[PDB]
Amino acid sequence: GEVKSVKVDNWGVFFLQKLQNFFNKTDYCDLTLQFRDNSQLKVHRLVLSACTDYFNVLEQTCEIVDDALIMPNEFQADVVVPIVNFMYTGTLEFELKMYGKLLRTAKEMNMTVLLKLLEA
Amino acid sequence: GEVKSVKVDNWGVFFLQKLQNFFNKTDYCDLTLQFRDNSQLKVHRLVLSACTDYFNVLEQTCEIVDDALIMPNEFQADVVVPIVNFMYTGTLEFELKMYGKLLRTAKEMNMTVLLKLLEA
């Protein structure tokens, strides 16, 4: 017999919206991003690694304190938060005053998908 | 200033296709499903948990041998493999002879999205 196939459309966005809920409730967040003001951001190591390798570099270079990765000086919540939110939604939420800094941050991470978006 | 927003369309499928590549290369696979013939299936614990809680129940009930979860008798590769592939793609690939068993398995997991698909 021949193998048949049926699908469920809009599964990508549906699956993505599920991971956003987990990110909102800090469910199964293995990676803890810790900023300069001791504020934390619980994320999924899989979601970030699927969008860039920059966070994988930080884990081998930056210091770790009690399961919390210390973010470098140029990589704080002003740029990290809206970029991570983009990974979970596909939407970049930002103020116009943050444009240049987000662009330079995107170049630093070499996040191509975010580079093209900012350079429309 | 007002917060602005730009987006990248088809991000859901794009992000989903990234996780499929990781699943193909066994990259960052934390959960190891071990079948009766000692065959293994490397999966992501996040992807499965986002589609059902059934695998979370197996981790608290079924035995674990060297980071490998022992699958129950009714839950083997004949049904597990095509169902997991659905989670990563949104497409259920199967033979017609497996229809009834996949349906009963879906009822057992209470995977609603797969139930409606099979009961079109």
Numbering used by the authors:
A (entry chain A), B (entry chain A): 2 to 121
Question: What does the study report here?
Answer:
To gain structural insight into the conserved CP190 BTB domain, we purified and crystallized native and selenometionine-substituted BTB (residues 1–135). Crystals belong to the space group P3221 and contain one CP190 BTB molecule in the asymmetric unit. The structure was built and refined to 2.5 Å resolution, yielding R and Rfree values of 21.9 and 25.9, respectively. The BTB domain forms a homodimer across a crystallographic 2-fold axis, adopting a canonical homodimeric structure as found in the BTB-ZF subfamily of BTB domains. Each chain in the homodimer has an α-helical core composed of six helices, α1- α6, flanked by a four stranded β-sheet (β3-β2-β5-β4) and a two-stranded inter-molecular β-sheet formed by β6 and β1' from the homodimeric mate. Key dimer contacts are made at this hydrophobic interface as well as a reciprocal N-terminal β-strand exchange in which β1 extends along the base of the homodimeric mate, forming a two-stranded antiparallel β-sheet with β6'. We analyzed the oligomeric state of the BTB domain using SEC-MALS.
The Drosophila melanogaster centrosome associated protein at 190 kDa (CP190) was first identified as a MAP using MT affinity chromatography. CP190 is a large multi-domain protein that has a distinct localization pattern that is tightly coordinated with the cell cycle.
